Design a protein around this ligand. Structure first.
Ligand SMILES: CCCCCNC(=O)N1CCC(C)CC1
Ligand SMILES: CCCCCNC(=O)N1CCC(C)CC1
Lengths: 193, 193
């Protein structure tokens, strides 16, 4: 019923590991899901609408996990608090590299993708800034930069840096080193005078 | 003679302020340069080869300026040393926003662009790492992260962050705040324990 939808989504994610969206046809999506081309079009208006949904589930999965984290503070030092948080994005997006990769290229092309990306980045930065302000109220962090400006730049560091390594871009931090690399820069910029 | 070449380049840069490369024709480039379509094709094989050259001159201008900077150390504190360096990329790319913007989208499309980007990023990161290692040998910076890993992440922060503000992306640091924002994170991650 809507299992067909889930089949189209899985087919697309599987196919995107091996070629870009450009070299995948609706034909290829329908085939994989075991439906006709016109039945495909019942569920989605384009291959692009399939990417968008994929990215939507990845982004919301990241977001929900961060909500679960924020509701249950891990009992640990500040370094470990930040690491646990950044890890939500490392694991989540790192488990969906094809979708991550395709979503990011699609930003230049698709206004819906760009907006979806935009909404969640705003949210996570807002959250980052809230935690930093809390850390300054507490007395644990110095009032250096505007919290929102710092949060913005740290989050953009994480987008670029997580995605370069996920794609094996030259240059990039190796994936097995990227978590530590980011946490250092976060902790040191948030706590440093 | 090759003034026609310079005319094509200026026409393209002027046109790119107002629409993407997709909505600019070879016709539009030839017109602006005051040549025929076939004479255009004498000088460049595509609109894309025109972008590539544009980006090449922007990137080399950035690079040469950093070479001039490295050869003549500005006599100042460490914060100001880094700021002066990051400023080379702020000013250079910030004076060529249309080209910057178009080059970055073209990375997903054009393998020549991606490689050109790749080469210079490797160079600037290598330079960043060399300066940090020097700062650790001097005794001025602690041996925290692997210098090259740190350099990689800081440079990727700068790419993403400079270009988001240049494009007025939501979200982004405002352009009049981005220099200070970056220098803070650099100095604090390089000098911090
Ligand atoms: C895919 C990267 C998108 C943004 C990455 N943001 C990020 O790392 N955060 C968000 C704030 C949390 C407290 C943990 C750190
Ligand atoms: C367009 C951004 C590309 C990379 C930006 N790199 C950057 O800011 N650097 C390079 C190292 C210098 C010592 C100054 C700081």
């Amino acid at each position: 019923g809507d299992d067909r939808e889930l089949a189209i989504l899985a087919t697309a994610e599987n196919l995107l590991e091996d070629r870009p969206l450009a070299d995948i046809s609706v034909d290829d999506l329908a085939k994989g899901a075991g439906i006709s081309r016109p039945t495909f079009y019942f569920y989605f208006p384009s291959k692009e609408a399939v990417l968008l949904t994929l990215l939507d589930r990845v982004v919301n999965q990241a977001d929900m996990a961060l909500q679960t984290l924020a509701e249950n503070p891990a009992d640990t030092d500040r370094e470990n608090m930040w690491r646990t948080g950044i890890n939500v994005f490392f694991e989540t997006f790192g488990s969906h590299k094809a979708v991550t990769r395709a979503g990011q290229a699609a930003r230049a092309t698709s206004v819906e993708v760009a907006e979806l990306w935009s909404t969640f980045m705003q949210k996570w930065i807002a959250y980052t800034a809230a935690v930093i302000d809390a850390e300054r109220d507490r007395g644990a962090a110095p009032r250096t930069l505007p919290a929102h400006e710092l949060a913005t730049a740290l989050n953009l560091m994480n987008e670029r840096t997580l995605f370069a390594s996920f794609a094996g871009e030259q240059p990039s931090v190796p994936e097995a080193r990227v978590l530590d690399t980011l946490v250092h820069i976060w902790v040191t910029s948030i706590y440093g005078e």
